[PDB]
Amino acid sequence: ARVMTRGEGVYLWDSEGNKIIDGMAGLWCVNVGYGRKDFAEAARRQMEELPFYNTFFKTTHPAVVELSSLLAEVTPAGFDRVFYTNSGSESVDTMIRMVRRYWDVQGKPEKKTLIGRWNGYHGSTIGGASLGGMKYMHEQGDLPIPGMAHIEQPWWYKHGKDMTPDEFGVVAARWLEEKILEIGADKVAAFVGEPIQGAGGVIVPPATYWPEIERICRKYDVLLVADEVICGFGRTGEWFGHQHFGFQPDLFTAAKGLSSGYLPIGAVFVGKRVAEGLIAGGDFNHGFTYSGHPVCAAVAHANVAALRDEGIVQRVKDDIGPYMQKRWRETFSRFEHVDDVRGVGMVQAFTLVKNKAKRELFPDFGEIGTLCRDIFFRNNLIMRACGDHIVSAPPLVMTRAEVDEMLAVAERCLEEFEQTLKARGLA
Amino acid sequence: ARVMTRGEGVYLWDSEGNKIIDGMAGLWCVNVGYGRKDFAEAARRQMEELPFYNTFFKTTHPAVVELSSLLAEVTPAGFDRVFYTNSGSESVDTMIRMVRRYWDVQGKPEKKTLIGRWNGYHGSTIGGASLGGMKYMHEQGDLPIPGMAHIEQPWWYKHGKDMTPDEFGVVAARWLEEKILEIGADKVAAFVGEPIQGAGGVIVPPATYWPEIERICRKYDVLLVADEVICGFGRTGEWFGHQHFGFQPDLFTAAKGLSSGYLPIGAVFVGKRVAEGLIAGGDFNHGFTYSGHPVCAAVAHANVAALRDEGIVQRVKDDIGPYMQKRWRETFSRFEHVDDVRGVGMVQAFTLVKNKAKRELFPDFGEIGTLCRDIFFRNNLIMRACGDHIVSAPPLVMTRAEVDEMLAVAERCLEEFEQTLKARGLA
Ligand SMILES: Cc1ncc(COP(=O)(O)O)c(/C=C/C(=O)C(=O)O)c1O
Ligand SMILES: Cc1ncc(COP(=O)(O)O)c(/C=C\C(=O)C(=O)O)c1O
Ligand SMILES: [Cl-]
Ligand code: NA
Ligand code: NA
């Protein structure tokens, strides 16, 4: 009858009194960790004083203006316009309509197709599911909607062949050039991608990938959109994934990580180029002014202020990031059936493989991931299996102690993994 | 630059010290009226104690179970399964995917087309905007996606011709039969409609309309979906619009009215037929179990408990509804350029017309509505203009006094309207 009692820092406690390490930070979003009583209070205060604004007033609710001011301080230059939503899924959907509307305004109404990636995830809307490349969303029949295409994911371990990462990076990106040319540049609105594919299994692209993607977008006059749903609000040590990989998207989407998951909220950050365009069109002015649930906005403000003023983000870049990465590699590198050990900031992962030498994957990709995950679970550690990949994204406020503590349990579980593997003769 | 200070009951106050009557209850959703400090407290408590649950636990957060249990008590028979979202727009989107998935499971994957209405509104997603029939989101571009069709709205004043309401009702509904037959019954997944079209201008369908719609859906094995975004949580005096019009939809969608707008939340209520179907498919099990932001769920619980236990809904049926309707008609019936005075419960409206005898509308439908609205606004009353329709949906806790007070100001504004009409020679 196991029931969650409470959560604190990086831990969750059950009814039987057991403590669970949340190596996933809820749904990749509990960035400041659990237990932030101060957030409850910011909520209480805002609900009490002014939980609504009205379009009667022709102004913006002060708790939204506040959030916007602070966001502009932590986001790259030129991201002045922000459109608030209730979720990452809505952010994606809004982004889609914004991209299409932008081209309309430009007198290029046939520029409508957005390109995404297989094993990409952009939420659960029809719009987002059709943009995302999860294989079990696309055979559905209705997905994808037209104006959606997909290229293969830059996953080196499977698609690298004999190429080096850097080399594969150029190839993997060039798939965007192929798809654009195949479709017609005059029909393509945008490429959308997570800097690191989260739900795809923390597929980290080679260093050559993103600058090539961007060159291609610019070449063919296609907008570039980063989906910062998972990589946003300090996850890679930078404020946003795209900053780490060193590309400048024309828009980017954010989700409940903006509030550490405390209340539902998302946003679309819009750059100068597109902002100017949407304003002339006027379609979205209402959202840029009146968007943002005030209570949610106040909790988001608290969370971002914590992220900055408590040096949580800088700490990922400087201290806990490098440490986690080093320790992550140290801990996991040595296993027989564990390969492509990878990570940046506080997102990290590895893949379970049949044989590292041949770079051979297990059959029925995901069944072996399940087996490993059940173990982490029976051992009161939360790490998720995406197919045969194992992924972790703990709260950003995790300590060096907590790091070692988590890895300790993971270590033990993987030892147990190899055994059960041999014990079954699947090793 | 007027700034909203606070809100209380049905009133909002500005920085200049003026009091404004909110005849619209925010965005049709502030059902229990402003100032509910008890909601702040339910929020504060939930955020403090347990603002998250984890899928590790294989149970449902208690604040969600609670909400579900209470909802089941107030919703019609057979609406056991509920899927929570953050918004009305998401609810619509989820509903669409549910409908399509249901038919897949049934071995009928080509049953994909949903039918909506012109001047219908089902939110702002791509999915919802393509289902809705606002022609200002329905031109040359992305919308609509395939698997979306539209029939004309049952708007008597324009489409009635020489028929009586009840007569027109049968015709207007039969448009669904025409569209189905035109498309092929084997390709049609569902008909979706707001019991009363809200943002379309509170178009109230004849009494014959909905039972006919349902007969047609059942005839052709097409699902029937009510969009209770605006009509839900007591607006028509009943719990849900469809109860008032006497049809039983297989699913219905709900929005922030579930929480009186205090925190973002929505839901899809799923009937036995479809629930059974989606469970066999298993696609949606995760949401039926783990869906619902707990903080939002706790605020929603408070709001529903208030709606019931404080007899706010009953009060709309018995007391304030009849009164408002009577007084609404009394007040507005007598004007030269005001016709189709209409309403049920606490939703009510009228249309500005050039000449009532010919049933002739003003040209550039909406310009005249703008002029009237500016007046309500310059007089510190909130009522919205949808084209040339004028609509009101004040909080449900409005008193007889507040009713008369609102109508008083509206009266004056309409007197002023007629004059400015003559003064321009547009009368
Ligand atoms: C890449 C990516 N883009 C968009 C969304 C949509 O945000 P929501 O509206 O909060 O669902 C998700 C969400 C899914 C998870 O959070 C998860 O993977 O657990 C996502 O991963
Ligand atoms: C009929 C109808 N169906 C669905 C939605 C979507 O809910 P949200 O996720 O809250 O946007 C809306 C929303 C818009 C308004 O309420 C408004 O027009 O003020 C709606 O009117
Ligand atoms: Cl595979
Ligand atoms: Na901790
Ligand atoms: Na029920």
Nearest to B186 by CA among B107, B240, B247, B242: B107
Domain residue limits at A318: 4-32+312-424
* Strand intervals (E) in B265-310: 266-270
Strands (E), A289-394: 338-344, 347-352, 381-382, 384-386, 389-392
Would you say A280 and A231 are in contact if contact means Cβ atoms under 8 Å apart? no
Distances (CA, A) of B427 to B338, B363, B418, B420: 12, 12, 7, 8
| Ligand 1 pocket test target in A89, A126, A231, A233 with most atoms within 8 Å of CB | A89
Residue A334: DSSP 8-state: T
Same domain, A50 and A142: yes
**CB-CB under 8 Å, B145 with A145:** yes
Atom of ligand 1 nearest to the CA of A92: 4
Rounded CA-CA distance A8/A369 in Å is: 28
Tokens 């070692």 map to which residue?
A404
Q: Are residues A55 and A163 in the same domain?
A: yes
3-state secondary structure of B176: helix
Contact between B22 and A129 using a beta-carbon 8 Å cutoff: no
DSSP summary character for residue A317: I
Both tokens assigned to B416: 């002023």
Contact B332, B410 (CB under 8 A): yes
| Contacts with A39 from chain B: Cβ below 8 Å | 47, 51
Is A90 within 8 Å of A84 (Cβ atoms)?
Answer: no
Determine the residue of chain B that is closest to A25 in CA distance. Answer: B54
Q: Which residue of chain B comes nearest to A43, CA vs CA? A: B44
Q: Which of residues 264-283 of B touch A (CB under 8 A)?
A: 264
Pairing mode, strands B223-227 and B266-270: unpaired
Please answer whether residues A194 and A121 qualify as being in contact, where contact means their C-beta atoms are separated by less than 8 angstroms.
Answer: yes
Q: Helical H runs in B135-239? A: 156-159, 165-183, 209-219
What are the phi and psi torsion angles at B382 (to 5°)?
A: -100, 110
**CA neighbor of B159 nearest in space, from B125, B222, B117, B110:** B117
Residues A345 and A319: beta-carbon distance below 8 Å:
no
- Do A23 and A44 lie in one domain? The reply is no
Q: Which DSSP string corresponds to A108-157? A: -TT--EEEEEBT----SSHHHHHHSB-HHHHTTSSPSPSSEEEE----HH
CATH classification at residue A232: 3.40.640.10
With a CB cutoff of 8 Å and minimum separation 6, the contacts of B256 are B27, B29, B87, B88, B262, B263, B264, B265, B266
Determine contact: A2 vs chain B, CB below 8 A.
yes
Rounded alpha-carbon distances, angstroms, from residue B327 to A18, B341, B356, B385: 62, 11, 21, 20
The three state secondary structure string of B309-367 is HCCHHHHHHHHHHHHHHHHHHHHHCCCCCEEEEEEECCEEEEEEEEECCCCEECCCCCH
Distance CA B20, CA B382 (A): 7
Q: What is the rounded distance in angstroms from the CA atom of residue B197 to the CA atom of residue B228?
A: 10
Nearest-CB residue to A126 (from B87, B93, B377)? B93
Whole-number Å distance between alpha carbons of B407 and B392: 11
Q: Report yes or no: A286 at the B interface, CB cutoff 8 Å.
A: no
B125·A125 Cβ contact <8 A: yes
DSSP-derived secondary structure letter, B204: P
For residue A147, the distance in angstroms to the closest alpha carbon of chain B comes to 8
Q: What is the sign of the dihedral through the CA atoms of A349, A353, A355 and A358?
A: negative
DSSP bridge partners of A81 = A270
Q: What residues 210-269 of chain B have any CB closer than 8 A to a CB of chain A?
A: 261-264
Rounded to the nearest 10 degrees, what angle do helices A37-49 and B37-49 cross at? 170
Cβ atoms of A120 and A213 within 8 Å: the answer is no
Min Cα–Cα distance to chain B from A321, Å? 25
**Tokens standing for residue B359:** 């049933």
Nearest one of A106, A136, A122, A426 to A280, comparing CA atoms: A106
The conformational region for residue A184 under phi > 0 = left, psi -120 to 50 = alpha, else beta, is left
Determine how many CB atoms are found less than 10 A away from the CB of residue A423. 10
In the reported structure, the alpha carbon of residue B266 is separated from the centroid of ligand 5 by a whole-number distance in angstroms of 17
Sheet containing A338-344: order of strands: A338-344, A347-352, A389-392, A384-386
Tell me B57's DSSP state: S
**Residue identifier of the C-alpha nearest atom 17 of ligand 1:** A27
Q: Is A410 helix (H, G, I), strand (E, B) or coil?
A: helix
Interface test with B, best of A46, A60, A86 (most B CBs within 10 A): A86
Total domains, chain A: 2
Is A289 labelled a binding residue? yes
Three-class SS state of A313? helix
Side-chain-facing half-sphere of A9: CA atoms under 13 Å: 10
State the residue for tokens 């998720």. A384
Give residue B227's region: left, alpha or beta (phi > 0; psi -120 to 50).
beta
The encoded tokens of residue B340 equal: 């189709």
Residue B77, helix vs strand vs coil: coil
Residue A89 labeled ligand binder: yes
DSSP A3-23: -EEEEEBTEEEETTS-EEEET
Residue A201 Cβ inside 6 Å of ligand 1? The answer reads no
How many CA within 13 A on the CB side of residue B37?
A: 3
Which amino acid is it at A27?
L
Which residues of A fall within a CB distance of 8 Å from B14? 57
Distance CA A99, CA A97 (A): 6
Distance of alpha carbon B424 from alpha carbon B427, whole angstroms:
8
Residues of chain B contacting A49 with CB distance shorter than 8 Å: 6
Considering only CB atoms, A44 lies closest to which of B40, B97, B100, namely B40
* CA dihedral for B97, B102, B108, B114, sign (positive or negative): negative
Q: Could you tell me the two tokens for B22?
A: 């909110």
Q: Are B178 and B171 in contact (CB under 8 A)?
A: no
Q: How far is CA A280 from the centre of its chain?
A: 31
Concatenated DSSP letters of A180-224: HHHH-GGGEEEEEE-SSBTTTT-BPPPTTHHHHHHHHHHHTT-EE
CA B26/CA A331 separation, integer angstroms: 55
- Which positions ≥6 away from A384 have C-beta within 8 Å? A24, A373, A390, A391, A392
Taking CA atoms, what residue in B is nearest to A112? B142
Instruction: For an interface test with B, give the residue of A6, A29, A30, A44 to mutate (most B CBs within 10 A).
Output: A44
First-to-final CA distance of chain B: 33
Contact map slice: A 177-216 vs B, CB within 8 A:
none
Residue closest to B113 by CA, chosen among B215, B184, B197: B184
Around A66, how many Cα atoms within 13 Å sit in the side-chain half-sphere?
A: 17
Optimal mutation site among B263, B265, B285, B290, interface A, most CBs of chain A within 10 A? B263
CA A159 to each of CA A164, A205, A357, A359: distance values in angstroms, whole numbers, following the listed order: 11, 12, 15, 11
Q: Are residues B24 and B64 in the same domain?
A: no
- Residue A192 shares a structural domain with residue A272: yes
Closest Cα to residue A84, out of A301, A312, A305? A301
Phi/psi at B303 (nearest 5 deg)? Answer: -70, -35
Going by C-beta distance under 8 Å and a sequence separation of 6 or more, which residues neighbour residue A115? A148, A149, A150, A151, A176, A179, A180, A183, A188, A190, A191, A192, A222
Q: Which of A54, A90, A382 sits opposite B26 (nearest CB)?
A: A54
- Report the binding-site residues of B for pyridoxal 5'-phosphate: 88-89, 289
Tokens 């608030």 belong to A84
Tell whether ligand 2 has an atom less than 6 A from the beta carbon of residue B198.
yes
Helix (H, G, I), strand (E, B) or coil at B381: strand
Spatial CB neighbours of A159, under 8 Å, sequence gap ≥ 6: A152, A153, A168, A172
Whats the size of chain B, residue-wise?
427
Residue where the block lists tokens 């008193």: B399
Q: Does the CB of A125 have a partner CB in chain B at under 8 Å?
A: yes
Cβ contacts of A377 within 8 Å, gap of 6 or more: B56
Is the separation of the CB atoms in A297 and A84 below 8 Å? yes
- Compute the distance between CA of residue B213 and CA of residue A56 in angstroms, rounded to an integer: 37
* Sign of CA pseudo-dihedral B360, B365, B370, B373: positive
A30 closest CB neighbour out of B30, B52, B127 = B52
Nearest to A120 by CA among A193, A195, A228, A211: A193
Question: Does B254 share its domain with B191?
Answer: yes
**Sign of the alpha-carbon torsion through B279, B282, B285, B287:** negative
Closest CA to ligand 1's atom 8: A88
Burial letters for A174-204: b for 16+ Cβ neighbours within 10 Å, e otherwise? ebbbebbeeeeeeebbbbbbbbbbbbbbbbb
Name the closest-CA residue to atom 3, ligand 2.
Answer: B122
Q: What are the phi and psi torsion angles at B150 (to 5°)?
A: -135, 140
Strands A223-227 and A251-254: parallel
How far does CA A171 lie from the centroid of its chain? 24
CA B262 / ligand 2 centre spacing (Å): 15
Angle at B286 between CA B283 and CA B290, to 5 degrees: 160
Residue B244 near residue B76 (C-beta atoms within 8 A): no
What residue type is assigned to position A333 of the chain?
A: S
Contact A223, A250 (CB under 8 A): yes
User: Contact A28/A391 with Cβ under 8 angstroms?
Assistant: no
Angle, alpha carbons A325-A212-A132 (nearest 5°): 75
Token pair of B23 as six digits: 């005849």
| Contact present, B219 and B227 (Cβ < 8 Å) | no
**Atom 18, ligand 1: residue with shortest CA distance:** A199
Query: What ranges in B35-164 are assigned the alpha helix state H?
Result: 37-49, 62-74, 88-105, 126-131, 156-159
Q: Do residues B169 and B261 both lie within one domain?
A: yes
Closest Cα to residue A126, out of B114, B281, B220? B114
Token pair for A365: 């990709």
B223-227 and B251-254: which strand pairing?
Answer: parallel
Task: Check whether residue B140 and residue B217 sit in a common domain.
Answer: yes
Any ligand 2 atom below 6 A from CB of B258: no
Residues in contact with A366: Cβ distance below 8 Å, sequence separation at least 6, in sequence order: A385, A387, A388
Ligand sitting nearest the alpha carbon of B90: 2
Residues A270, A358, single domain; the answer is no
> Are B119 and B155 a contacting pair, CB within 8 Å?
yes
Residue B260 phi/psi, 5-degree rounding, is 55, 20
3-class SS at B281?
helix
Domain boundary among B267, B282, B309: B309
Burial degree of B301 (CB within 10 A; 0-12, 13-18, 19+): buried
Cβ-based neighbours of B180, under 8 Å, separated by 6 or more: B115, B188, B216, B220, B222
Of B262, B279, B309, the residue that ends a domain is B309
Q: Which residues of A touch B22 (CB under 8 A)?
A: 54
**What is the C-alpha to C-alpha distance for residues A67 and A32, in angstroms, rounded to an integer?**
17
> Closest partner residue to B39 among A47, A59, A97, by Cβ?
A47
Rounded CA separation B414/A202 (Å): 62
**Within this chain, do residues B279 and B349 fall inside the same structural domain, yes or no?**
no
Separation of alpha carbons B307 and B260, rounded Å? 10
Token pair, residue A33, equals 């960790």
* B414 and B331 part of one domain: yes
Q: What is the rounded radius of gyration, in angstroms, for the C-alpha atoms of chain A?
A: 22
Distance separating alpha carbons of residues A384 and A374, to the nearest angstrom: 10
Pairing mode of beta strands A223-227, B11-14: unpaired
Q: B122 alpha carbon to ligand 2 midpoint, in Å?
A: 6
Q: What is the DSSP letter of A57?
A: S
Measure the CA–CA gap between A260 and A22, rounded to whole angstroms: 14
Supply φ then ψ for residue A31, to 5 degrees.
-75, -40
Residue A198 in tokens: 């989260």
- Give the pair of three-digit tokens for residue B408: 């008083």
Please give the structure tokens belonging to residue A218. 């610019």
Structure-solving method: X-ray
| CA-closest candidate to residue B51, choices B296, B264, B267 | B296
Residue positions of B in the annotated binding site?
A: 88-89, 289
Q: How far apart are CA A239 and CA A316, in angstroms?
A: 10
**Close Cβ partners of A174 (under 8 Å, ≥ 6 residues apart):** A212, A216
By most ligand atoms within 8 Å of CB, the mutation choice from A230, A236, A265, A268 for ligand 1 is A230
Taking alpha carbons only, the member of A319, A340, A380 closest to residue A17 is A380
Set of chain A residues whose Cβ sits within 8 Å of the Cβ of B49: 6
**Nearest CA among B71, B178, B195 for reference residue B122:** B195
Alpha carbon distances (Å) from A225 to A45, A216, A367, B86, B316? 36, 13, 33, 24, 48
Q: Tell me, in Å, the resolution of the deposited structure.
A: 2.0
- What tokens appear for A34 in the block? 């659990």
Rounded CA-CA distance A29/A356 in Å is 32
CATH number, position A393 = 3.90.1150.10
- Ligand 2 center to residue B27 CA distance, Å? 8
Q: Please, which residues bridge with residue A381 across strands?
A: A21
Nearest to A307 by CA among A226, A203, A235, A411: A235
| B41 to A43: CB separation less than 8 angstroms, yes or no | no
Q: Is B91 left (phi over 0), alpha (psi -120 to 50) or beta?
A: alpha
Residues B12 and B64 in one domain: no
Q: Which of B391, B420, B273 is nearest to B382 (CA)?
A: B391
Give the C-alpha separation, B273 to B90, whole Å: 22
Which contiguous run of DSSP H or E holds residue B420? helix B400-424
Half-sphere exposure at residue A387, Cβ-oriented, CA atoms within 13 angstroms: 20
Last residue of some domain: A258, A283, A309?
Answer: A309
Cis check: omega of the bond before A264, within 30 degrees of 0: no
Ligand closest to Cα of B226 equals 2
